[PDB]
Amino acid sequence: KYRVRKNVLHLTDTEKRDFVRTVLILKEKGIYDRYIAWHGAAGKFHTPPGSDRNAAHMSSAFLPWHREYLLRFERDLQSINPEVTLPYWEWETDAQMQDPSQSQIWSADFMGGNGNPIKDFIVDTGPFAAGRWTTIDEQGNPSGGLKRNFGATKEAPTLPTRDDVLNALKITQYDTPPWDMTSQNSFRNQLEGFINGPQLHDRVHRWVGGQMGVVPTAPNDPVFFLHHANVDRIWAVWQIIHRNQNYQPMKNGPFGQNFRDPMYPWNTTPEDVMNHRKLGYVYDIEL
Amino acid sequence: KYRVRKNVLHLTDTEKRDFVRTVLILKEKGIYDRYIAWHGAAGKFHTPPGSDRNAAHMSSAFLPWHREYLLRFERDLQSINPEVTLPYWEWETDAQMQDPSQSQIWSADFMGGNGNPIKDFIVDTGPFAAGRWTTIDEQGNPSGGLKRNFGATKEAPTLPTRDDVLNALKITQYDTPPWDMTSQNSFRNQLEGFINGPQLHDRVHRWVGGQMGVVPTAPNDPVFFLHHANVDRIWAVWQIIHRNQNYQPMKNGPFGQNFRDPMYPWNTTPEDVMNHRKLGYVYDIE
Ligand SMILES: [Cu+2]
Ligand SMILES: [Cu+2]
């Protein structure tokens, strides 16, 4: 419990110019791509083969898989600049605005704005605008520039609300059988957004649109990591208030989903990442 | 060093049965599938994006990437049965047969045989025959059964020969710019099989056919690992003949290809797996 992680809205200007600069360095060095690829790779590892569950989504491991992913990413940030931690995008509060698109998390000094509808929704403002930031597709080849299209779908016109988050936090069980999108009374499935969906996580992806709207390719947008830090924060909060609850399934879920199974593409297990402060970080709202 | 990887032809019946049994356990457990997936994932990781080099093939990291892969695989075998090590298929010796398909490697108590023509070359003999061994496709779903067609293509009608291997072993440089399929006078490119191809490695994949003939999905056939153990063995031989030669490139190559770059999907570097006897194994010959 040392490295913090702060609300994007509470970050000094200097902190943002430094976060963005560090992300650009990781991209230049070839490291950022590894994260895009890892995510896509996990999506093709079905547990078991033929199931809709995969190593990183639509099943128990969703939360610890992303925790590990962010942890590795934050370590790579810190190897460049030890003062840089991963911030979180508190979307539930942005949802309160008339036009969430006006949030400072899209400012030209940070993540840049919505896509330009005249350009096939290509982001042309901010540090990740086309020409300054190249994306890759699922073959692993350059794919022409970041796209975003806020709230453009009928299923996800708006971001999740504070009440949506509070309601998820009331759920007592981490997950329930059959450990997939049909799980009910499950914190995991609720937060992932498949109970009467899309809700929460799944809704944020859909709301942002562009690369974020396609799960495999989503990490092409740096906001992906901000989004997931918020998901991780919500989980950490759930763990704090439900101290006697533990990860499920403990055993006899599909291989890759159990407490002590390795999470492809790594050897890391859910047990390894259950306690976030032991990992070396904390969320501001804890302090 | 004292894990000993043996020629398939020098394995006892018991060693063969134990190897097979262990591979089937790994598959049942869900672990084998991690190896298929890793391979596929590295194939989609281009170094740099847009080029025809990838993390595991058609570039300098081809050899160390596969050495790491096999090392992880053998450690998984060992965790099931501590006596099992990864054997190697010395194809260059089978190439001397009148009919290589009669090699003991394709025994009904080891890898099983060639595919059946009237069942569209589905393997119906051995421990990995259809109904006893499922395969997965590039997308990670079930794809219906192991298939093999020995020597069916015009470009690779035969296995590489002893002289093919000897000639590769004479090359003085590990690799050369631009560190890709077009590299000349490079041991890596010669062994991988792209100098006047397809020869050696690439030739073996093409000769076996079926899943083996398609690089990403190749792992689906257990003989993949025995083939790569032979490739690793041949590299280890080269490393001793040219003991004053080291991995290349050392710096200014694409990220993921240099001596101290991590090899996607892992953090392991080529430096890490340079010396194989520091990794805990040797080949019987040595
Ligand atoms: Cu994801
Ligand atoms: Cu390969």
Token digits of residue A57: 């989504």
Comparing CB atoms, the residue among B34, B142, B256 nearest residue A30 is B256
When scoring B25, B44, B137, B269 by the number of chain A Cβ atoms within 10 A, the one with the most, hence best to mutate, is B44
Do A44 and B41 make contact, defined as CB atoms within 8 angstroms? yes
The four Cα atoms A100, A104, A107, A113 give a dihedral, to 10 degrees, of: -20
Q: Could you give the CA distance from residue A14 to residue A6 in angstroms, rounded to a whole number?
A: 14
Report d(CA A229, CA A237) in Å as an integer: 12
Cα-based torsion angle of the residue sequence B144, A41, A140, A75 in order, rounded to the nearest 10 degrees:
-170
Q: Cα dihedral sign for B111, B115, B121, B127?
A: negative
Q: In sequence order, which ranges of B30-110 are alpha helices (DSSP H)?
A: 32-43, 62-80, 91-94
Of B37, B142, B255, the CB nearest to A41: B37
Answer whether A44 sits within 8 Å of B46, measured CB to CB.
Answer: no
Identify whether the C-beta of residue B274 lies closer than 8 Å to the C-beta of residue B281: no
Smallest CA-to-CA distance from B212 within B127, B283, B121, B148 is with B148
**In chain A, which ranges are continuous DSSP H helix?**
13-29, 31-43, 62-80, 91-94, 162-169, 187-192, 201-208, 223-241, 276-279
Q: Is the peptide bond before B265 cis (omega within 30 degrees of 0)?
A: yes
- CA A119 – CA B8 distance, rounded (Å): 60
Distance, in Å, from the CA atom of B109 to the CA atom of B92, rounded to the nearest integer, reads 22
- In what helix (H) or strand (E) does residue A282 lie, and over which residues does it extend? strand A281-283
Does residue B30 belong to the interface with chain A, where contact is any CB pair within 8 Å?
Answer: yes
Q: What are A21's two structure tokens?
A: 């600069």
Put simply, the answer to whether B136 touches A264 (Cβ < 8 Å) is no
C-alpha B168/C-alpha B158 separation (Å) is 18
Task: Measure the CA dihedral B205/B192/B251/B170, to 10°.
Answer: 160
The burial of A78, by beta-carbon neighbours within 10 Å (0-12 exposed, 13-18 middle, 19 or more buried), is given as middle
Residues 6+ apart with CB under 8 A from A33: A27, A136, B45, B49
3-state secondary structure of B247: coil
Measured between alpha carbons, how far is A201 from A223 in angstroms, rounded to an integer? Answer: 13
- Nearest-angstrom CA–CA distance, A19 and A10: 13
Q: Residue B166 belongs to what H/E stretch?
A: helix B162-169
Q: Cβ neighbours of residue A173 under 8 Å, at least 6 residues apart?
A: A185, A186, A187, A245, A248
Tell me how far CA of residue A24 lies from CA of A21, A27, A30, A129, A144, in angstroms.
5, 5, 10, 12, 17
Residues B185 and B121: beta-carbon distance below 8 Å: no
What is the rounded distance in angstroms from the CA atom of residue A218 to the CA atom of residue A201? 12
Structural domains of chain A in order of their starting residue, each with its CATH number: 1-287 (1.10.1280.10)
**CB nearest to A37's CB, from B31, B136, B264:** B264
CA closest to A50 among chain B residues: B141
